[PDB]
């Protein structure tokens, strides 16, 4: 519209209306020029890592992309509390996205001292991939989100993708994408950008913990009309074989017939946060649960959703079983345990098997007069008819949605790191500075121009999500567990800035506080 006019206003709010919540967040972003306007082939050799499990082939692009795929992008900590204490479930419905107040800057550096000026005629390009034609990187739990704290100014991350590799080489089946090959909207400083998106129908994420367990569903006062085999021998001595049967009843609850059984399991190794209880050897990689694809090993991480530990043992955690978040200020490599926050899934132990335990036992032979009954341990158990389970929890720090891979078949496509699986997720939003070449020579040359005016852009983004709520209906008489702050005094308020202006999130906050019957 105009240079001296603003193309949008700041909106950060929550609106709680009945069965729905609407979040809106505005942030300030900065987009650099990436790769100095080049597409580049990258590989593990351009990086230098040699291991087969780590080999890759791909491209880096000049483009950036917006990532709002974490819950703290949309919820303040008070909003999250207000969500999780009152609601049995929630799920996303609609999305509104705006890009406005674009400013392109020119950087000049004569002697190590940068001068910055407005370039009023430069453009930024933006498009959404609404046909899902690009590789989709928003579901890999990458950094670069809109920051949780609204006053922080964030950097737009660089878009890059991988294709098929063999070692560090490509194959004929490998795909290369030019993002210039898509139509996009060009924005000078007066222009703004928007689009809206409709989420596809997904289940409500369950945000409750079961107050009843899968093996206790019986009436404790009454017998079954079913019999179980109680005794195979009369007593000591030879030739004592017999068949004795008893009613399964309140006093022996382990043997009662049950309609539903616990969900599937893939065993994780158990580690203690008391390190002297751990073994004196390196087993982080060697003891890991893994899966193999085309000759390469991937860690099973976080893997199938399983109870983190047994009742009363909170010092143990599955090795690659749980999502692990870092504290504010924590470094990149080889930090101590007090630097990280380890989530635990204990609320699902009512229906989901424990991650560090066997699923159970099966018979391994035919017993006989000459052979004793033998059993063996089930270390991994696929879906059986009659299993029920809970998916993994979502966190304030965690991801919201993933893209379901496009395949012939999938089973229960809920993303393993947690959240809502979608065949058509929120589309990727791509952005770049339009290159402005430096002065060309005065005689024609056929080469592409390699010399550009140094630029970066900045602006505002607003994202608005309508969320559908499932309100708690409970008849429970006694009071629930609620997420709460602690009154006791401290140097800092939690979920606030400190004396240096640094916002931090001191803990992970899951969604499961209220209870339901099983």
């Amino acid at each position: 519209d105009g240079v001296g006019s603003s193309s949008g206003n700041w909106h950060c709010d929550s609106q709680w209306l009945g069965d729905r919540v609407i979040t809106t967040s505005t942030r300030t972003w900065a987009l650099p020029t990436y790769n100095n306007h080049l597409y580049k082939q990258i590989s593990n050799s351009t990086s230098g890592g040699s291991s087969n499990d780590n080999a890759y082939f791909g491209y880096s692009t000049p483009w950036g992309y917006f990532d709002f795929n974490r819950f703290h992008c949309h919820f303040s900590p008070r909003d999250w509390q207000r969500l999780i204490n009152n609601n049995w479930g929630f799920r996303p419905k609609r999305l509104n996205f705006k890009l406005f107040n674009i400013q392109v800057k020119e950087v000049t550096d004569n002697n190590g001292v940068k001068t910055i000026a407005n370039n009023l005629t430069s453009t930024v390009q933006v498009f959404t991939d609404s046909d899902y034609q690009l590789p989709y990187v928003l579901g890999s739990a990458h950094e670069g989100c809109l920051p949780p704290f609204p006053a922080d100014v964030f950097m737009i991350p660089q878009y890059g993708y991988l294709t098929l590799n063999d070692g560090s080489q490509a194959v004929g089946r490998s795909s290369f994408y030019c993002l210039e090959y898509f139509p996009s909207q060009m924005l000078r400083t007066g222009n703004n950008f928007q689009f809206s998106y409709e989420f596809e129908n997904v289940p409500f994420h369950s945000s409750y913990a079961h107050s009843q367990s899968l093996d206790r569903l019986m009436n404790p006062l009454i017998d079954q009309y079913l019999y179980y085999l109680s005794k195979t021998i009369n007593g000591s001595g030879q030739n004592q074989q017999t068949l004795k049967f008893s009613v399964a009843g309140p006093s022996n609850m382990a043997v009662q017939g049950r309609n539903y059984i616990p969900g599937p399991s893939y065993r994780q190794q158990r580690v203690s946060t008391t390190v002297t209880q751990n073994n004196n050897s390196e087993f982080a990689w060697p003891g890991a649960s893994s899966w193999a694809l085309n000759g390469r090993n991937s860690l099973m991480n976080p893997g199938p959703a399983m109870a983190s530990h047994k009742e009363g043992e909170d010092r143990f955690f599955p090795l690659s079983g749980s999502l692990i978040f870092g504290k504010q200020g924590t470094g990149r490599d080889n930090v101590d345990a007090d630097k990280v926050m380890i989530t635990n899934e204990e609320e699902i132990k009512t229906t989901n098997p424990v991650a560090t335990e066997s699923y159970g036992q099966v018979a391994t032979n035919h017993q006989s007069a000459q052979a004793q009954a033998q059993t063996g341990w089930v270390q991994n158990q696929g879906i059986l008819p009659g299993m029920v389970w809970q998916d993994r929890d979502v966190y304030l720090q965690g991801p919201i949605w993933a893209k379901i891979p496009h395949t012939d078949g999938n089973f229960h496509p809920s993303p393993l790191m947690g959240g809502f699986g979608m065949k058509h997720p929120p589309p990727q939003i791509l952005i770049k500075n339009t290159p402005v070449p430096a002065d060309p020579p005065t005689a024609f040359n056929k080469d592409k121009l390699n010399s550009f005016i140094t630029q970066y852009s900045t602006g505002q983004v607003s994202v608005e999500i309508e969320w559908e709520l499932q309100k708690e209906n409970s008849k429970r008489w006694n009071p629930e567990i609620q997420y709460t702050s602690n009154y006791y005094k401290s140097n800092n308020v939690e979920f606030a800035v400190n004396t240096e202006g640094v916002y931090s999130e001191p803990r992970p906050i899951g969604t499961r506080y209220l209870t339901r019957n099983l």
Epitope: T33, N36, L38, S43, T108, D109, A438, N450, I453, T454
Partner: antibody, heavy 131, light 108 residues
Amino acid sequence: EVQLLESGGGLVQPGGSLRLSCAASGFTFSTYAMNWVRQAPGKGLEWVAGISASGGSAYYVDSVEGRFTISRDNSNNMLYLQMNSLRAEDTAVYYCAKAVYAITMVRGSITTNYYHYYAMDVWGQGTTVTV
Amino acid sequence: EIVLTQSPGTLSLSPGERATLSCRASQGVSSNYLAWYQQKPGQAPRLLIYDASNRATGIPDRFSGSGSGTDFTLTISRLEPEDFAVYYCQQYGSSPPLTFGGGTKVQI
């Protein structure tokens, strides 16, 4: 100051394999293209091999093609030249050399991409290989 | 491989005299991209001029260079004693192999 220090050269029989290494410091190594230059006794300099800053593009003189392999490690600041099937005329002094331009350069208001091969600004001292 | 030939071979001039060297290319050298190197006995070679006229950092101000197309010149004005050495021209303007000139020697 930029320093190129090479080691691993020496005398060996013909037909043998010798892996020549070079250690660099004083500059960001992954942003520069590297070279191997060769001078036989009493004769001028001969450019042998050169390698892209990324490592994905590696070139050789016509004579040594297929015999020599140039490679680099951006984490270790190391340039490697490994030789196979050495000959009477491969005997010489071998120099490390660094291109004068980084792949991207900032001057004034302008940022420039330099991905070609450029004049060699810094040299190592040389290490003799006798076949 | 496109060839560089140096016009003067084993040239000798008295100190304090202008020195003019000429490197001739069989093929045009793309967007200049020629380089002059100095080597001294038992000493690693040293960059003087890169591209056409462009002088390296630590180099005396008396060294000059110019050229276009197939003809390039290295000029040494106000000659001094340390300037006795073998000189070379390098062509990076094409695709590799980078090829040095044959070499040229400047005596006393």
